[PDB]
Design a protein around this ligand. Structure first.
Ligand SMILES: Nc1ncnc2c1ncn2[C@@H]1O[C@H](COP(=O)(O)OP(=O)(O)OP(=O)(O)O)[C@@H](O)[C@H]1O
Ligand SMILES: Nc1ncnc2c1ncn2[C@@H]1O[C@H](COP(=O)(O)OP(=O)(O)O)[C@@H](O)[C@H]1O
Ligand SMILES: Cc1cn([C@H]2C[C@H](O)[C@@H](COP(=O)(O)O)O2)c(=O)[nH]c1=O
Ligand SMILES: [Mg+2]
Ligand SMILES: [Mg+2]
Ligand SMILES: [Mg+2]
Ligand SMILES: [Mg+2]
Ligand SMILES: [Mg+2]
Ligand SMILES: [Mg+2]
Ligand SMILES: [Mg+2]
Lengths: 189, 187
């Protein structure tokens, strides 16, 4: 059965911090956990490709999608099948926010690509660490871009209000962790 | 104006040879020409990575699509915009034949991915160099290659106004002369 959880937010919003704290927290409860990440959980060498100068946004998304396809097939679905809690530090929503709202690619196309790439796999909960855009720190990742991405993430959360849990990324680390834990307690068990 | 042409077929069907001969013919006529190829015309690192990695068909297609997206935008469209005849040794049909018919991915999905990746750019003519896998120059493993060969033939019979199918086992010069005869009305 398993449980699929993701962390999302701008660069520097505390995703990795919270994903790792959550993994350790759940491991301490005796739960089998698999901690993974994008980009690179599927095809580690995609990280080299993604640094290529002057990439079209289309090519950028297609690279993230290639990694995502491998990631879902070889890592996430097998983890879930073994009954693990699988936590991914970034997932599809990162592409929707960055390549969609940030770069301007059409969301329906992103979703059509993803439908095969992800085999339709959706997280049960997505913890969005909402960070002011000026605090964030690929090419052209400036303030205008980060404002679009930040608001994009908030739009995705309003559209799927049961899946997304929106948290103020500027709260103390331990307060955010307790909030994440509270949202999880009824799901585990 | 610009004119976009592609060559397709199995590895060892004579694509590079005929692409070279076609560009030479065009050069002899004083017609500006650009020769290119996939994979690697957009992102060389995709070609070299996939030399030594086995991926799911979906991931493979998506990497080839990233390459193609760069190839179209950075190489092909600018060549066409300059009025060149651009000849690509492999294009979208390669992914449809290999990842679609060969490895089983659904063609409508492949085509929806490609719609943005290629900006809808389609060749005016595609020369398919057809031969059985056992005739490609340079039991159970041959099944994949027969799916690809048959897939190419399926693509060709669906778009007879775009594909020209040639017997790849003919002598080189004769194939080249056939390509020239098909191309002459379009210059
Ligand atoms: N709640 C917080 N308050 C203040 N600083 C934090 C908080 N959480 C994490 N940090 C610090 O912010 C920085 C970025 O955190 P982290 O690497 O977890 O973010 P991220 O979202 O994973 O970034 P990236 O997108 O670059 O991977 C680190 O220096 C980290 O210690
Ligand atoms: N019509 C032909 N007859 C005989 N040999 C050929 C012919 N066309 C190409 N060759 C030779 O066959 C091999 C494969 O040709 P090549 O153009 O590299 O095919 P591809 O690019 O499709 O793999 C090369 O060694 C080439 O010299
Ligand atoms: C997973 C993913 C990340 N990104 C960006 C966020 C970061 O700037 C960069 C790498 O992610 P990371 O810094 O969290 O490892 O890639 C996208 O633009 N789209 C995606 O789909
Ligand atoms: Mg954020
Ligand atoms: Mg991080
Ligand atoms: Mg995707
Ligand atoms: Mg997510
Ligand atoms: Mg072959
Ligand atoms: Mg060749
Ligand atoms: Mg494509």
């Amino acid at each position: 059965p398993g449980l699929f959880l993701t962390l999302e937010g701008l660069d520097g919003s505390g995703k990795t911090t919270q994903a790792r704290r959550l993994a350790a927290f759940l491991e301490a409860q005796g739960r089998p956990v698999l901690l993974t990440r994008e980009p690179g959980g599927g095809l580690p060498e995609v990280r080299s490709l993604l640094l290529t100068q002057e990439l079209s946004p289309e090519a950028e998304y297609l690279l993230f999608s290639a990694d995502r396809a491998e990631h879902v097939r070889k890592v996430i679905l097998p983890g879930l099948a073994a009954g693990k809690v699988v936590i991914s530090d970034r997932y599809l929503d990162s592409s929707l926010a960055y390549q969609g709202y940030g770069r301007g690619l059409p969301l329906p196309w992103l979703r059509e690509v993803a439908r095969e790439a992800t085999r339709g796999l959706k997280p049960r909960l997505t913890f969005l660490l909402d960070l002011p855009p000026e605090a964030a720190l690929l090419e052209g990742l400036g303030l205008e871009f980060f404002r679009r991405v930040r608001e994009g993430y908030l739009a995705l959360a309003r559209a799927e209000p049961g899946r997304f849990v929106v948290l103020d990324a500027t709260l103390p680390e331990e307060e955010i962790a307790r909030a994440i834990q509270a949202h999880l307690r009824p799901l585990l068990p």
